[PDB]
């Protein structure tokens, strides 16, 4: 596992702990799945904090009860003032995505390929190493976004401005 | 045509414990403690290790190794339980906190001392009694047909636990087996009388013997 998506020019196959020192492809493909899974969430979460921390809101009335989007605070306090009928819909739809329409159903080219032959914005017009270059970009962009969103969550409860 | 146990009462050798009653043929004399005592004929209907599953529910013919397994485990508990019926009344009791409650371990009636001590006292006793019965099944499952009854791998012979040495002679070892079995059968009768007198008197046996081995206050 020394020349793959994670092998980078600054640190090629870092691996300090005792994770994959064997020929276990099935253990690597599970761990590569979750790292791409944590990265794709934390990429939207870094933007999803800095949109709310900048005060940007949807144009108003998150409910018919008379609660605007600007009334909902930013950060960890957002989950407390979201109305609970809509808090179920956030968990039900994300669960609808994560159970049904997010998987490698038809069989993709790699780990994390969720194009089931349904949505495809190209992926044929590439140089076959630009495919591996674009895949290694979203791994490392997903890598920095995990440490990014962990910094914004540890320093909100601390109160330190960033 | 005939029963498998009616043919064992047809041979029906002479007995020693019931010398007027003609013990059945399934007491071959080859077992330890064979004194020809089976008036109800349980040895003619031998039992198998039913706890291992449905494949072990049926008993082999002429094999009383699981009746002897149940005889030894009843008698080994009954020996420890005679002392447990006695020793709180003789050597005092244990003290309690305000957590367990004071006078929790102090009930000298041994039967309602079960409901007086905390449940964690009995849960940990039961789980330690459980742990050696897990040890017994892992010995029975491993040895199978070559398992001698009462073996928890404690003592003299093969790779058993022997922290005391205990290297008996190979014929002094068979009188220790007979001393154990005769104390197994005796303490089973003794722990029944301890349990039945503790209900009939309501006190422990030292408060019952000690009140009967003393002179009355109007007589002194």
């Amino acid at each position: 596992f020394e020349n793959e998506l994670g092998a980078q020019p600054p640190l090629g196959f870092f691996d300090p702990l005792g994770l994959v020192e064997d020929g276990n492809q099935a253990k690597f493909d599970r761990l590569r799945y979750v790292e791409l899974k944590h990265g794709r969430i934390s990429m939207l979460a870094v933007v999803g904090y800095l949109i709310e921390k900048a005060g940007i809101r949807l144009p108003g009335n998150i409910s018919y009860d008379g609660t605007s989007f600007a009334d909902i605070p930013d950060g960890f306090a957002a989950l407390s003032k979201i109305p609970d009928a809509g808090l179920f819909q956030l968990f039900a739809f994300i669960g609808f995505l994560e159970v049904f329409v997010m998987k490698d159903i038809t069989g993709g080219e790699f780990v994390g390929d969720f194009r089931n032959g349904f949505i495809d914005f190209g992926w044929d017009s590439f140089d076959e190493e630009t495919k591996l270059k674009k895949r290694a970009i979203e791994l490392n962009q997903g890598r920095a976004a995990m440490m990014g969103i962990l910094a914004l969550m540890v320093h909100e409860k601390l109160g330190v401005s960033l | 045509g005939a029963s498998p146990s009616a043919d064992a009462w047809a041979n029906s050798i002479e007995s020693k414990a019931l010398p007027f009653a003609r013990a059945p043929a399934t007491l071959d004399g080859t077992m330890l403690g064979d004194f020809g005592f089976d008036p109800l004929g349980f040895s003619t209907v031998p039992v198998g290790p039913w706890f291992t599953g449905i494949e072990g529910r049926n008993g082999q013919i002429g094999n009383l190794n699981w009746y002897r397994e149940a005889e030894l485990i009843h008698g080994r508990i009954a020996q420890v339980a005679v002392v447990g019926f006695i020793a709180p009344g003789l050597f005092g009791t244990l003290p309690g906190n305000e957590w367990t409650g004071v006078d929790a371990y102090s009930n000298l009636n041994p039967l309602e001392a079960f409901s007086q001590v905390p449940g964690l006292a009995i849960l940990q006793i039961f789980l330690f009694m459980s742990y050696l019965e897990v040890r017994r099944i892992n010995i029975i499952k491993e040895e199978g047909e070559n398992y001698m009854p009462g073996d928890l791998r404690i003592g003299q012979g093969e790779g058993r636990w022997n922290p005391f040495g205990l290297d008996y002679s190979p014929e002094a070892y068979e009188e220790k087996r007979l001393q154990e079995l005769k104390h197994c059968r005796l303490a089973m009768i003794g722990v029944f009388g301890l349990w039945a007198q503790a209900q009939a008197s309501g006190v422990g046996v030292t408060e019952q013997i000690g009140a009967a081995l003393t002179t009355p206050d109007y007589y002194a």
Partner: protein, 168 residues
Amino acid sequence: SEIELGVTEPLGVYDPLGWLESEPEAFERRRAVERKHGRVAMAAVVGTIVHNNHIVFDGYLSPSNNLKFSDIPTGVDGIRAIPTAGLAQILAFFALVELAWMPASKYDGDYGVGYFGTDIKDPEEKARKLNVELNNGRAAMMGIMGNMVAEVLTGQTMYEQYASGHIS
């Protein structure tokens, strides 16, 4: 086979559109829709009976919105009295039924549950019950559609249509 599964005596095949000769490849889904529309309409019309008989659940549907189970109307607008998180829980659970557990794209109509749990192995007895699931579904489709138009045209629910003398 599913081709003879819906034909009974007093109508037989009965295609005024003739859609078994024309486009016969679409019959395998139209049977799956008629079986699906039948099973929903049977459960909708035995539920209309128990709604208007007042067999309610004696509690609160939503105490945060102060909805007792008896507060919901027993007619056509009773589905609208269910709140936002109430209708979201129905859409979330039956997405797990219609796509995962008993997937509604499976055109067999056969999700391994049988008729009260048993495989009817007699093929003449099994073909009789599937004529019954279709015929009682067909009569409930006209039943549940003759109950909505009997409420939106008279205003009353079924309990009030019967406790008025307003049948004839």
